[PDB]
């Protein structure tokens, strides 16, 4: 417990804003939409299946 006070590790999310989509960080709406569209249509289905 003393070590946890000195060196806590990531254990859980803040449930209000846990993570942000990476294409929010994109330079450009065309790229960002392409990433979102591919994420929605292809990658997230595959990973949820995987």
């Amino acid at each position: 417990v003393d070590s946890v006070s000195a060196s806590p590790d990531f254990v859980d999310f803040v449930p209000t804003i846990p993570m942000q989509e990476i294409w929010t960080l994109c330079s450009s709406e065309a790229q960002a939409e392409a990433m979102r569209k591919h994420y929605d249509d292809v990658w997230a289905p595959a990973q949820s299946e995987k």
Binding site: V1, V4, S5
Partner: protein, 51 residues
């Protein structure tokens, strides 16, 4: 003149015992610091005071 003796004996015993114990405990603490907060789960006053 004839003699006969006959005996039959039977005994039966059955015994059944059952025991069951179940415990549940839930503790939660907010505020202070979490490391001292874990201390109150000892139930020991000095650790409660330390929290």
């Amino acid at each position: 003149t004839g003699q006969l003796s006959a005996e039959a004996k039977a005994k039966y015993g059955e015994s059944i015992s059952s025991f069951t114990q179940y415990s549940n405990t839930h503790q939660e603490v907010r505020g202070g610091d979490g490391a001292k907060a874990h201390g109150v789960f000892s139930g020991k006053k000095e650790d409660f005071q330390a929290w």
